[PDB]
Design a protein around this motif. Structure first.
Motif, PDB file in Angstrom:
ATOM      1  N   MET A 109      14.865 -49.441 -82.387  1.00  0.00           N
ATOM      2  CA  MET A 109      14.821 -50.172 -81.228  1.00  0.00           C
ATOM      3  C   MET A 109      15.281 -49.718 -79.857  1.00  0.00           C
ATOM      4  SD  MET A 109      16.654 -52.508 -78.988  1.00  0.00           S
ATOM      5  CE  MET A 109      18.301 -52.618 -79.825  1.00  0.00           C
ATOM      6  N   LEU A 110      16.288 -48.810 -79.897  1.00  0.00           N
ATOM      7  CA  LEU A 110      16.495 -48.078 -78.906  1.00  0.00           C
ATOM      8  C   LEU A 110      15.375 -46.725 -78.260  1.00  0.00           C
ATOM      9  CD1 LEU A 110      20.432 -47.608 -79.109  1.00  0.00           C
ATOM     10  CD2 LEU A 110      19.075 -49.419 -77.561  1.00  0.00           C
ATOM     11  N   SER A 111      14.728 -46.718 -79.337  1.00  0.00           N
ATOM     12  CA  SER A 111      13.817 -45.454 -78.838  1.00  0.00           C
ATOM     13  C   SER A 111      12.319 -45.723 -78.993  1.00  0.00           C
ATOM     14  CB  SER A 111      14.069 -44.137 -80.151  1.00  0.00           C
ATOM     15  OG  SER A 111      13.380 -44.662 -81.349  1.00  0.00           O
ATOM     16  N   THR A 112      12.034 -47.259 -79.168  1.00  0.00           N
ATOM     17  CA  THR A 112      10.767 -47.680 -79.212  1.00  0.00           C
ATOM     18  C   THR A 112      10.456 -47.339 -77.500  1.00  0.00           C
ATOM     19  OG1 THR A 112       9.319 -49.467 -79.280  1.00  0.00           O
ATOM     20  CG2 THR A 112      11.612 -49.925 -78.562  1.00  0.00           C
ATOM     21  N   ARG A 113       9.301 -47.148 -77.340  1.00  0.00           N
ATOM     22  CA  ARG A 113       8.647 -46.679 -76.051  1.00  0.00           C
ATOM     23  C   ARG A 113       7.131 -47.262 -76.095  1.00  0.00           C
ATOM     24  NH1 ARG A 113      10.799 -42.543 -72.625  1.00  0.00           N
ATOM     25  NH2 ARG A 113      11.974 -41.627 -74.264  1.00  0.00           N
ATOM     26  N   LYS A 114       6.725 -47.433 -74.902  1.00  0.00           N
ATOM     27  CA  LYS A 114       5.182 -47.871 -74.495  1.00  0.00           C
ATOM     28  C   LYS A 114       4.530 -46.612 -74.044  1.00  0.00           C
ATOM     29  CE  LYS A 114       5.806 -52.504 -72.726  1.00  0.00           C
ATOM     30  NZ  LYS A 114       5.558 -53.437 -71.753  1.00  0.00           N
ATOM     31  N   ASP A 115       3.212 -46.510 -74.453  1.00  0.00           N
ATOM     32  CA  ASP A 115       2.536 -45.293 -74.050  1.00  0.00           C
ATOM     33  C   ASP A 115       2.108 -45.435 -72.417  1.00  0.00           C
ATOM     34  OD1 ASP A 115       0.402 -43.234 -74.764  1.00  0.00           O
ATOM     35  OD2 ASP A 115      -0.897 -44.609 -73.798  1.00  0.00           O
ATOM     36  N   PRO A 116       1.943 -44.451 -71.857  1.00  0.00           N
ATOM     37  CA  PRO A 116       1.506 -44.508 -70.408  1.00  0.00           C
ATOM     38  C   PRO A 116       0.453 -45.328 -69.872  1.00  0.00           C
ATOM     39  CG  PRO A 116       1.515 -42.169 -71.334  1.00  0.00           C
ATOM     40  CD  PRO A 116       2.041 -42.971 -72.219  1.00  0.00           C
ATOM     41  N   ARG A 117      -0.497 -45.429 -70.823  1.00  0.00           N
ATOM     42  CA  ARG A 117      -1.560 -46.304 -70.534  1.00  0.00           C
ATOM     43  C   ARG A 117      -1.511 -47.699 -71.242  1.00  0.00           C
ATOM     44  NH1 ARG A 117      -6.211 -43.371 -68.245  1.00  0.00           N
ATOM     45  NH2 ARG A 117      -5.182 -42.605 -66.589  1.00  0.00           N
ATOM     46  N   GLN A 118      -0.492 -48.051 -71.715  1.00  0.00           N
ATOM     47  CA  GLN A 118       0.070 -49.165 -72.537  1.00  0.00           C
ATOM     48  C   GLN A 118       0.676 -50.168 -71.727  1.00  0.00           C
ATOM     49  OE1 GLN A 118       1.580 -48.426 -76.602  1.00  0.00           O
ATOM     50  NE2 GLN A 118       1.037 -50.553 -77.066  1.00  0.00           N
ATOM     51  N   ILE A 119       0.306 -51.362 -71.636  1.00  0.00           N
ATOM     52  CA  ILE A 119       0.867 -52.510 -70.823  1.00  0.00           C
ATOM     53  C   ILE A 119       1.945 -53.306 -71.689  1.00  0.00           C
ATOM     54  CG2 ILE A 119       0.564 -54.744 -69.767  1.00  0.00           C
ATOM     55  CD1 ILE A 119      -2.285 -53.692 -68.893  1.00  0.00           C
ATOM     56  N   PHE A 120       1.542 -53.531 -72.904  1.00  0.00           N
ATOM     57  CA  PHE A 120       2.454 -54.511 -73.947  1.00  0.00           C
ATOM     58  C   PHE A 120       2.943 -53.664 -74.907  1.00  0.00           C
ATOM     59  CE2 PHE A 120      -0.333 -57.729 -72.003  1.00  0.00           C
ATOM     60  CZ  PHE A 120       0.493 -58.650 -71.413  1.00  0.00           C
ATOM     61  N   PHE A 121       3.827 -54.363 -75.703  1.00  0.00           N
ATOM     62  CA  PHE A 121       4.313 -53.544 -77.163  1.00  0.00           C
ATOM     63  C   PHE A 121       3.549 -53.768 -78.194  1.00  0.00           C
ATOM     64  CE2 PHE A 121       8.588 -53.263 -74.994  1.00  0.00           C
ATOM     65  CZ  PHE A 121       8.957 -51.929 -75.119  1.00  0.00           C
ATOM     66  N   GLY A 122       2.929 -52.778 -78.836  1.00  0.00           N
ATOM     67  CA  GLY A 122       2.130 -52.994 -79.983  1.00  0.00           C
ATOM     68  C   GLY A 122       0.454 -53.178 -79.599  1.00  0.00           C
ATOM     69  N   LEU A 123       0.327 -54.089 -78.456  1.00  0.00           N
ATOM     70  CA  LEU A 123      -0.908 -54.029 -78.102  1.00  0.00           C
ATOM     71  C   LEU A 123      -1.639 -52.902 -77.469  1.00  0.00           C
ATOM     72  CD1 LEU A 123      -1.138 -57.864 -76.892  1.00  0.00           C
ATOM     73  CD2 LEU A 123      -1.034 -56.970 -79.067  1.00  0.00           C
ATOM     74  N   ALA A 124      -3.099 -52.771 -77.657  1.00  0.00           N
ATOM     75  CA  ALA A 124      -3.685 -51.711 -77.107  1.00  0.00           C
ATOM     76  C   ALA A 124      -4.692 -51.963 -75.875  1.00  0.00           C
ATOM     77  CB  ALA A 124      -4.361 -50.684 -78.294  1.00  0.00           C
ATOM     78  N   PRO A 125      -5.096 -51.002 -75.056  1.00  0.00           N
ATOM     79  CA  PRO A 125      -6.103 -51.407 -74.114  1.00  0.00           C
ATOM     80  C   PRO A 125      -7.450 -51.763 -74.913  1.00  0.00           C
ATOM     81  CG  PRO A 125      -4.817 -49.768 -73.339  1.00  0.00           C
ATOM     82  CD  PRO A 125      -4.370 -49.933 -74.674  1.00  0.00           C
ATOM     83  N   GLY A 126      -8.135 -52.662 -74.240  1.00  0.00           N
ATOM     84  CA  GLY A 126      -9.332 -53.175 -74.937  1.00  0.00           C
ATOM     85  C   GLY A 126      -9.512 -54.091 -76.045  1.00  0.00           C
ATOM     86  N   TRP A 127      -8.250 -54.598 -76.380  1.00  0.00           N
ATOM     87  CA  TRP A 127      -8.198 -55.896 -77.357  1.00  0.00           C
ATOM     88  C   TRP A 127      -8.200 -57.115 -76.657  1.00  0.00           C
ATOM     89  CZ3 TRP A 127      -3.392 -54.618 -81.327  1.00  0.00           C
ATOM     90  CH2 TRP A 127      -3.835 -53.258 -81.845  1.00  0.00           C
ATOM     91  N   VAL A 128      -8.871 -58.034 -77.315  1.00  0.00           N
ATOM     92  CA  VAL A 128      -8.984 -59.332 -76.876  1.00  0.00           C
ATOM     93  C   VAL A 128      -8.177 -60.336 -77.607  1.00  0.00           C
ATOM     94  CG1 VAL A 128     -10.542 -61.182 -76.509  1.00  0.00           C
ATOM     95  CG2 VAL A 128     -11.301 -58.950 -75.868  1.00  0.00           C
ATOM     96  N   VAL A 129      -7.182 -60.777 -77.270  1.00  0.00           N
ATOM     97  CA  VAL A 129      -6.260 -62.097 -77.835  1.00  0.00           C
ATOM     98  C   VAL A 129      -6.949 -63.529 -77.789  1.00  0.00           C
ATOM     99  CG1 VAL A 129      -3.948 -62.771 -77.945  1.00  0.00           C
ATOM    100  CG2 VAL A 129      -4.296 -60.195 -77.398  1.00  0.00           C
TER     101      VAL A 129
END
Ligand SMILES: Nc1nc2c(ncn2[C@@H]2O[C@H](COP(=O)(O)O)[C@@H](O)[C@H]2O)c(=O)[nH]1
Ligand SMILES: [Mg+2]
Ligand SMILES: [Mg+2]
Ligand SMILES: [Mg+2]
Ligand SMILES: [Mg+2]
Ligand SMILES: [Mg+2]
Ligand SMILES: [Mg+2]
Ligand SMILES: [Mg+2]
Ligand SMILES: [Mg+2]
Ligand SMILES: [Mg+2]
Ligand SMILES: [Mg+2]
Ligand SMILES: [Mg+2]
Ligand SMILES: [Mg+2]
Ligand SMILES: [Mg+2]
Ligand SMILES: [Mg+2]
Ligand SMILES: [Mg+2]
Ligand SMILES: [Mg+2]
Ligand SMILES: [Mg+2]
Ligand SMILES: [Mg+2]
Ligand SMILES: [Mg+2]
Ligand SMILES: [Mg+2]
Ligand SMILES: [Mg+2]
Ligand SMILES: [Mg+2]
Ligand SMILES: [Mg+2]
Ligand SMILES: [Mg+2]
Ligand SMILES: [Mg+2]
Ligand SMILES: [Mg+2]
Ligand SMILES: [Mg+2]
Ligand SMILES: [Mg+2]
Ligand SMILES: [Mg+2]
Ligand SMILES: [Mg+2]
Ligand SMILES: [Mg+2]
Ligand SMILES: [Mg+2]
Ligand SMILES: [Mg+2]
Ligand SMILES: [Mg+2]
Ligand SMILES: [Mg+2]
Ligand SMILES: [Mg+2]
Ligand SMILES: [Mg+2]
Ligand SMILES: [Mg+2]
Lengths: 196, 118, 140, 55, 95, 97, 288, 105
Positions: G247-267
């Motif tokens: 949990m301390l080392s979890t990180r977001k990709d520099p092109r990622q907005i949310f945690f786990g989710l990826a660009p282009g996905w439709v929720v």
RNA sequence: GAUAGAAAUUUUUAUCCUGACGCUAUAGAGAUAGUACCGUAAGGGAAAGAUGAAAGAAUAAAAUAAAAGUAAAAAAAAGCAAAGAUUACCCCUUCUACCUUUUGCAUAAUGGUUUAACCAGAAAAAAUCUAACAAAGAGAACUUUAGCUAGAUACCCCGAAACCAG
RNA sequence: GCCUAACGAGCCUGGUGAUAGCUGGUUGUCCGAGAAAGAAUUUUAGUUCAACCUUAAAAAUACCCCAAAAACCCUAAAUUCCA
RNA sequence: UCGGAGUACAAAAAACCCUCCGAGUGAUUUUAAUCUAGACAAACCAGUCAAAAUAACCAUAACAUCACUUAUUGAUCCAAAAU
């Protein structure tokens, strides 16, 4: 709350023509000098007989304002509290009747000394039993409303309030939610973690 | 220009005959003033009006008791043309706590201690 | 919502009732009555203030008449009656003059006696002679 | 958010604040609302007092 | 000042006030002394320094500028490395 | 100031008709209904005045913007003239400034 | 308790016929009618004031106005383009954690802060996120994986003392609105966009390990942490062997907005489902 | 205005107070309503202190009429046959008592 | 300078539930009518109705007899027309009409014969009061170093010579 | 000059409820307090500030003010500041 | 428009198409800085003083001086330089 209920829905359809909207009055009735009478411009001035109204009402006016939600909830709570305190609130179960005769309700009310005016609240509109529906369809002082139709104006208008147990539980749950709630980031109709 | 007036010191040096003329003790000056405003403060300067106001002489023909100290004597000198000043005389001494409610002030200046007893 | 005045009849009558006894058009026309009624009220207050002065002047005139009828002048009569510690005001004095002639003559005789005693004292300039009616009675 | 004897609460508050000011503090009681209004900033002191009293 | 606009019906603001004035969130208005760039060769060093210094505004001018401006210019701004962020608030004002 | 000489027919107004008995019955539709509908939707009236309130100038501006494309010729002319007059009066006339 | 309820028993029925507002709540309006309020009706004698033709506010009667004789100087010049960062005190963060508004057991994000109501971000007002200040660094006793846009040096030191992780990232206004209000964006029906890179003015800030930039070299993070610990005289916690190291080392990709989710996905929240693009061009665009 | 209105000389009814004093208030009729909000003061007066007034003044006949009236009234009829009609519309109990005592006096 | 003023980007769930805290013949449309009438024409532009179930009940029946204007019923020294009063209408005593504008008006400075009906203060930025909740407030977009939300407190009428277009 | 009884430029309609620092008017009762002008200004027929004044709220000193003190050729009534 | 004297006799202010002097700058070198307490004056805009601390000259001054020294001057905006 009562004044808000009376007023927010009001739209006054009163409008009077000003001096710019009356038909004629486009020219000076007489020259400014020499005539010996008072000076006038349009013959439709507010001074004249058929002239326009000086200020009057101007078009449809909307007296719409929205009270804060917590204030409205507190008003509902206070109405229920005073209704209970003044011995004008009665809790029944399932709101069932033996017969569909409005005279039966009249005799029951005058026997129980409920009062001249009675407002019966049920949980859901479509779940109200046909007996009480037909009994109250023919009465003026006996008014039957769903749970979502409860308000301070009608609570004060009717001397006696009648609530079913599911209606009481519904009102309790709906009114106690605002005492420990966050402010809405977006309208509560949108999905939330713990709210429909 | 019309301004305040400085009264020379020789005005307030009494003559030996003045004591007998006005009935004053040549040795011991009296202790308390009885001051009664006669004239109005209208058509008089604002400083005179203010002195009258601060002396408690707003209402006319109502005597007020004051000290005989120079601090108030200065103001009384300033507005001496609008007031009547008499010495407060006490034939029966100062009113005691048991005689506060039965006292009166005569027009001739003696404060009687027992006024209409019984 | 159009609002119009419906009690204007009573509003006009409340003023017109105070001008019924006037002369001219002031008793009928409202425009000429409001001004006349206001002047009537102002004169009523001023004359209420002046009634006391007028009645005091009348009483003083009657006292002068009675005193001169008794061979005495009004200032002398008043000052000697005061010196005799007789605190009767002008209204009572005029009432006595009109309805109590013997009592008024007695009062005039007392005033003349006090005047004579005062004149004798002033002429003598003696402390030891004191008038019988010149003695002052203190509060008892 | 005062429920109960708001007059008793005002008495307790004035007794607590009298030694601090050297005089009886000026207070206003809204019984229909249930509010106490003291003249001056005593917010932190009153918060500590209520914590000690157990509210 | 346009109290009621013809398009939105809102209240407008004059741009001269914001172009030559600065408002701190505490209510004060900051301005530059007039004539601080005019004929500097003709002025003493003390006078030039006085002209260069920033100055405040009194109550009347502050209320006037508040009337001319809208509520967008009286908001709390958290800028990156704001020179006047320390002056945005007022401390130890005993009134 | 002449006033009528006969009693007007006393209006027998009842307080228990349908409208008076059900006046504002769903005013708390949102609060007691798991919010879907604002009390705005219960307002019946002109399109440009449902759930909105403003002074005369704002009302005229909103009416012209919303239903101004369906107004008659003289109605639109009168609305434009009223808008101009209200603008001039509100932005150039008054005491408090 | 409520003795008013018992008092109401003796009182008659509460109806619409006996209702009164609070005294002083409604100041009565006054009209220019009567002797006192008539006769120029509070407007004065002749001039412009009684006829309502006064000049504007800034006018001084022909004199050069005060608001116009002052020279123009840049005070609000470019105000609509300056970056704004809502401050978040360590004291406020500790208060939220203690009251349970935010859970330290999970990585703290701007979305989590907004949900816990600790901060309010208005992207239309040029806010670029949340900065960390040191106003409560003395009594900060929480170990969190904080994720802000700017961080003070002392705030970073205070968090690393307890053994958290501080990461400063950049969010363009669109992604910032999406982060602040994800549910409205999910009801908008649009695919999650990519996170724009910071401009040239902010690249040095976010590519340095001293500021814990999200684009910085991870190899220089331990050196900066050790320098910070030596400067502020505390031992650097053994973060690697912690229970919550993931949990301390979890990180977001520099092109990622949310945690786990990826660009282009439709929720699709109505059906509780996620739609992922499969076209090569779409995937290249969204991952580029 | 004295010139506009009528006038009379000071006098007493039937040489009242010479041989004996006879109270001049003969009857007092209250007309009130049992439910009108404007009659609340009259209702409280009748509930509380009409009996005390009746006992204090045995020479006056007091009638009370609860009828559907909008304005409550009091009618004082004296030995002269004079009738004085007053309105007790929206007045406190103390005001009613003062008015009734004034009428009796 | 007065002032003018976007956009990118966001929100908006179907139908009935619609009538009136709008006027009642100087009001509401100008309207009984664009008719009479006024102009060569373009054009301007009104006022005017009141019984009753029955007038196929007018040797007709009942309510107000309340505005100004008159009659019933012309006036008797003297005076801003009234007041104080008075046994008594005058006779006695006292008061330089009212608005507006002015340093100041009985002023011989303006306005009005009178009656009736119409005729003139309108806005919520900052503030004050009241209330809700409160480091948070608001039913979406904002403001927040006690603040946010709601309500109540505010800013007239008539008048030119003129200018432009057809 | 004349151009449909008013021509230094016709009349009607529309802009138009033109605009007036200019004149006139501005409608219930009672109560509290209550103002005669220093500076700018195509400004002195007007506005905007200051000084006064009104309505609320915080405080503590406010007027009267003896000494002592305030310029050098001569100089009055008296001023300023103060217990 | 700005300054000096009288009006305006002794703290300050104080008007007239009131009575008289003047200014719209010259000469010379000591070429006279930064930052900041506290003050004067003042409707506002402007105008004036100034302790302590800083770098260079005696290691002991720097307020540029004189011409009655007081007046020798002009706001924003906008135009130009090299910022
Ligand atoms: N400027 C000014 N005018 C006044 C003052 N007092 C009265 N007025 C004016 O004088 C007239 C009324 O005179 P008064 O009734 O005061 O004798 C009115 O025009 C009034 O405005 C004042 O103190 N200052
Ligand atoms: Mg027209
Ligand atoms: Mg025209
Ligand atoms: Mg015109
Ligand atoms: Mg017509
Ligand atoms: Mg009309
Ligand atoms: Mg008297
Ligand atoms: Mg007002
Ligand atoms: Mg109003
Ligand atoms: Mg007035
Ligand atoms: Mg008038
Ligand atoms: Mg004037
Ligand atoms: Mg006027
Ligand atoms: Mg000029
Ligand atoms: Mg913000
Ligand atoms: Mg210009
Ligand atoms: Mg008509
Ligand atoms: Mg008649
Ligand atoms: Mg006469
Ligand atoms: Mg005169
Ligand atoms: Mg005047
Ligand atoms: Mg004159
Ligand atoms: Mg004359
Ligand atoms: Mg004259
Ligand atoms: Mg004239
Ligand atoms: Mg005249
Ligand atoms: Mg006039
Ligand atoms: Mg005339
Ligand atoms: Mg506001
Ligand atoms: Mg032109
Ligand atoms: Mg012609
Ligand atoms: Mg006009
Ligand atoms: Mg002018
Ligand atoms: Mg008064
Ligand atoms: Mg002013
Ligand atoms: Mg001295
Ligand atoms: Mg002193
Ligand atoms: Mg000073
Ligand atoms: Mg130094």
């Amino acid at each position: 709350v009562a004044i808000w209920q009376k007023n927010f829905k009001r739209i006054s359809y009163a409008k009077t023509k000003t001096r710019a909207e009356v038909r004629g009055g486009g020219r000076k009735p007489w020259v400014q000098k020499g005539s010996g009478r008072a000076r006038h411009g349009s013959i439709r001035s507010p001074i004249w007989r058929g002239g326009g109204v000086a200020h009057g009402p101007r078009g449809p006016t909307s007296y719409y304002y929205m009270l804060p939600m917590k204030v409205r909830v507190q008003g509902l709570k206070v109405a229920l509290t005073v209704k209970l305190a003044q011995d004008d609130l009665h809790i029944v179960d399932s709101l069932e009747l033996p017969t569909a005769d409005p005279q039966y309700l009249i005799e029951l009310a005058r026997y129980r000394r409920w009062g001249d005016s009675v407002l019966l609240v049920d949980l859901e509109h479509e779940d109200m039993p046909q007996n009480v529906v037909a009994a109250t369809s023919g009465l003026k002082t006996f008014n039957l409303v769903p749970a979502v139709g409860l308000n301070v104006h009608s609570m004060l208008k009717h001397q006696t309030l009648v609530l079913t147990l599911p209606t009481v539980a519904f009102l309790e749950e709906k009114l106690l939610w605002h005492n420990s709630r966050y402010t809405p980031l977006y309208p509560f109709r949108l999905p939330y973690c713990d709210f429909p | 220009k019309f301004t305040r007036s400085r009264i020379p010191d020789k005005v307030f040096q009494p003559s030996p005959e003045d004591h007998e003329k006005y009935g004053g003790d040549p040795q011991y000056p009296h202790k308390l003033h009885i001051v009664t405003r006669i004239k109005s403060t209208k058509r008089r300067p604002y400083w005179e009006k203010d002195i009258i106001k601060m002396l408690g002489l707003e209402k006319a023909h109502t005597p007020q008791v004051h000290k005989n100290i120079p601090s108030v004597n200065a103001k009384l000198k300033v507005v001496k043309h609008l007031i009547r000043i008499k010495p407060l005389k006490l034939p029966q001494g100062l009113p005691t706590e048991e005689d506060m409610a039965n006292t009166c002030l005569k027009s001739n200046g003696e404060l009687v201690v027992r006024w209409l007893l019984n | 919502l159009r609002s119009r005045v419906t009690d204007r009849y009573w509003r006009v009558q409340e003023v017109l009732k105070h001008a019924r006894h006037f002369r001219g058009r002031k008793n009928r026309c409202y425009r000429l009555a409001v001004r006349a009624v206001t002047r009537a009220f102002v004169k009523c207050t001023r004359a209420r203030r002046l009634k006391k002065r007028s009645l005091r002047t009348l009483w003083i005139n009657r006292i002068t008449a009675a005193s001169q009828e008794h061979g005495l002048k009004y200032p002398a009569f008043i000052i000697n009656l005061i010196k005799c510690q007789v605190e009767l005001n002008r209204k009572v004095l005029a009432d006595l003059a009109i309805y109590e002639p013997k009592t008024f003559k007695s009062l005039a005789a007392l005033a003349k006696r006090r005047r004579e005693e005062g004149f004798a004292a002033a002429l003598g300039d003696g402390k030891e002679p004191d008038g019988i009616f010149s003695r002052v009675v203190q509060h008892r | 958010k005062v429920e109960g004897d708001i007059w008793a609460l005002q008495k307790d508050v004035e007794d607590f604040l009298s030694p601090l000011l050297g005089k009886t503090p000026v207070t206003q009681v809204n019984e229909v609302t249930g509010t106490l209004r003291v003249k001056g900033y005593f917010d932190q002191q009153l918060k500590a007092w209520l914590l000690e009293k157990g509210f | 000042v346009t109290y009621f606009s013809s398009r939105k019906g809102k209240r407008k603001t004059v741009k001269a006030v914001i172009y030559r004035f600065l408002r701190l969130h505490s209510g004060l208005w900051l301005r530059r002394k007039a004539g601080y760039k005019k004929k500097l060769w003709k002025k003493t060093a003390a006078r030039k320094r006085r002209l260069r210094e920033f100055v405040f505004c009194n109550k009347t001018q502050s209320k006037l500028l508040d009337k001319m401006t809208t509520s967008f210019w009286k908001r709390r701004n958290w800028y990156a490395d704001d020179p006047y962020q320390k002056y945005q608030d007022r401390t130890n004002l005993k009134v | 100031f002449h006033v009528r000489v006969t009693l007007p027919p006393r209006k027998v107004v009842d307080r228990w008709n349908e409208k008076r008995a059900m006046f504002g019955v769903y005013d708390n539709i949102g609060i007691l209904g798991n919010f879907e509908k604002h009390p705005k939707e219960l307002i019946k009236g002109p399109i440009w005045l449902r759930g909105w309130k403003g002074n005369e100038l704002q009302r005229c501006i909103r009416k012209k913007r919303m239903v101004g494309n369906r107004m008659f010729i003289d109605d639109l002319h009168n609305l434009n003239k009223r808008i101009s007059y209200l603008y001039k009066h509100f932005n150039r006339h008054g005491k408090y400034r | 308790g409520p003795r008013a309820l018992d008092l109401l028993r003796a009182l008659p029925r509460v109806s619409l016929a006996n209702l009164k507002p609070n005294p002083g709540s409604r100041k009565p309006e006054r009209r220019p009618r009567g002797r006192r309020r008539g006769r120029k009706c509070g407007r004065g004698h002749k001039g412009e004031r009684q006829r309502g033709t006064r000049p504007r506010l800034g006018f001084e009667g022909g004199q050069t106005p005060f608001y116009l004789r002052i020279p123009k100087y840049g005070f609000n010049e470019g105000h609509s383009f300056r970056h704004q960062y809502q401050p978040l005190s360590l004291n406020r963060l500790q208060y939220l954690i203690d009251l349970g508004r935010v859970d330290p057991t999970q990585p703290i994000d701007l979305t989590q802060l907004v949900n816990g109501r600790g901060v309010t971000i208005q992207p239309s007002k040029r806010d670029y996120g949340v900065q960390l200040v040191e106003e409560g660094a003395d009594t900060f006793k929480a170990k969190v994986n904080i994720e802000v846009q700017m961080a003070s040096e002392l705030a970073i030191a205070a968090i690393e003392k307890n053994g958290g992780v501080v990461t400063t990232a950049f969010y363009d206004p669109r992604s910032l609105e999406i982060l602040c209000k994800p549910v409205p964006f999910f009801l908008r029906g649009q695919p999650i966009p990519k996170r724009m890179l910071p401009p040239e003015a902010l690249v040095p800030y976010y590519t340095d390990a001293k500021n814990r930039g999200y684009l910085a070299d991870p190899a220089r993070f331990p050196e900066a942490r050790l320098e910070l610990a030596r400067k502020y005289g505390y031992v650097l916690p053994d973060i690697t062997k912690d229970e919550l190291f993931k949990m301390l080392s979890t990180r977001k990709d520099p092109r990622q907005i949310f945690f786990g989710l990826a660009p282009g996905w439709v929720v699709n929240m109505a059906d509780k489902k996620i739609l992922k693009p499969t076209d090569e061009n779409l995937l290249k665009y969204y991952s580029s | 205005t004295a010139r506009g209105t009528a006038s009379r000389f000071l006098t007493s009814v039937l040489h009242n107070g010479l041989g004996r004093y006879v109270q001049q208030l003969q009857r007092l009729s209250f007309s009130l309503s049992r439910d009108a909000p404007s009659s609340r003061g009259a209702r409280e007066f009748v509930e509380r202190e009409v009996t005390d007034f009746a006992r204090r003044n045995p020479g006056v006949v007091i009638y009370v009429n609860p009828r559907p009236c909008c304005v409550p009234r009091v009618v004082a009829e004296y030995l002269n046959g004079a009738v004085r009609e007053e309105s007790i519309h929206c007045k406190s109990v103390e005001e009613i008592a003062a008015l009734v005592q004034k009428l009796a006096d």
